[PDB]
Design an enzyme around this catalytic site. Structure first.
Site, PDB file in Angstrom:
ATOM      1  N   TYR A  37       0.793  -1.426  -0.096  1.00 31.10           N
ATOM      2  CA  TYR A  37      -0.014  -0.062   0.049  1.00 31.10           C
ATOM      3  C   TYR A  37       0.838   1.319   0.037  1.00 31.10           C
ATOM      4  CZ  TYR A  37      -3.532   3.616   1.311  1.00 31.10           C
ATOM      5  OH  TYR A  37      -4.163   4.642   1.354  1.00 31.10           O
ATOM      6  N   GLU A  59     -10.724   5.293   6.054  1.00 31.17           N
ATOM      7  CA  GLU A  59      -9.925   5.772   7.248  1.00 31.17           C
ATOM      8  C   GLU A  59     -11.130   6.061   8.278  1.00 31.17           C
ATOM      9  OE1 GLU A  59      -7.801   9.136   6.475  1.00 31.17           O
ATOM     10  OE2 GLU A  59      -5.953   7.817   5.518  1.00 31.17           O
ATOM     11  N   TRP A 101      -4.887   1.188  10.503  1.00 28.68           N
ATOM     12  CA  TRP A 101      -5.074   1.767   9.160  1.00 28.68           C
ATOM     13  C   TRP A 101      -4.811   0.068   8.382  1.00 28.68           C
ATOM     14  CZ3 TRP A 101      -2.339   2.830  13.388  1.00 28.68           C
ATOM     15  CH2 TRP A 101      -1.195   2.455  13.496  1.00 28.68           C
TER      16      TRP A 101
END
Length: 187
Positions: free
Chosen positions: A16, A38, A46
């Site tokens: 990511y 989020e 996360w």
């Protein structure tokens, strides 16, 4: 050649981080999901959002954001059972409002992405710390930015969630001294 350091195991961090993170995005579609995904980070990590992010698109993308803004309360109740994503009913209902408030603002042709990060006075910010620990999770723009989204009627906008979105977009340039080629460390 060294970059970051807290990344370890779970290729999702590097995968990511390499895919995005640190790359300022101005696309309302891509940025719209960043703040929405989020939002669930509240209490979660996360990294966990990334896994659910794929599952979220599996059920939400099928209905297309358009229906998410004009769906029905029975639709969210259905996902509570079959979905594969965090179930809380309240959290799901929150996403529905985001699509409704998101289209209302875009209905005027106003760019959502340009507004959220523009709060930095059309002047991106940069950091020069030695490690991520020195970097603060609450910057002046984060507090002012969260207050702006609050007006739109978006929930889960604590200063911590805004900070995560700030690092994900790229508004702040994070680069520990010696990161590939971080300058400013000259005499």
């Amino acid at each position: 050649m060294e970059r970051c350091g807290w990344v370890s195991q779970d290729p999702l961090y590097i995968a990511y981080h390499d895919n995005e993170w640190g790359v300022p995005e101005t696309d309302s579609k891509k940025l719209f999901e960043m703040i929405c995904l989020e939002g669930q980070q509240a209490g979660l990590s996360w990294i966990t959002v990334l896994k659910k992010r794929e599952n979220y698109r599996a059920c939400f993308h099928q209905f297309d954001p358009v229906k998410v803004a004009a769906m029905q309360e029975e639709d969210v109740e259905r996902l509570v059972q079959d979905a594969g994503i965090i179930r809380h009913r309240g959290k799901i209902q929150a996403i529905i409002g985001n699509a409704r408030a998101y289209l209302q603002m875009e209905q005027n042709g106003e760019p959502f992405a340009d507004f959220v990060w523009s709060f930095v006075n059309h002047q991106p910010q940069m950091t020069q710390a030695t490690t991520l620990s020195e970097i603060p999770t609450s910057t002046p723009a984060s507090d002012a930015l969260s207050k702006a989204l609050k007006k739109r009627g978006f929930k889960f906008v604590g200063t911590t969630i805004c900070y995560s979105f700030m690092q994900a977009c790229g508004l702040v340039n994070d680069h520990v001294v010696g990161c590939c080629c971080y300058p400013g460390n000259k005499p």
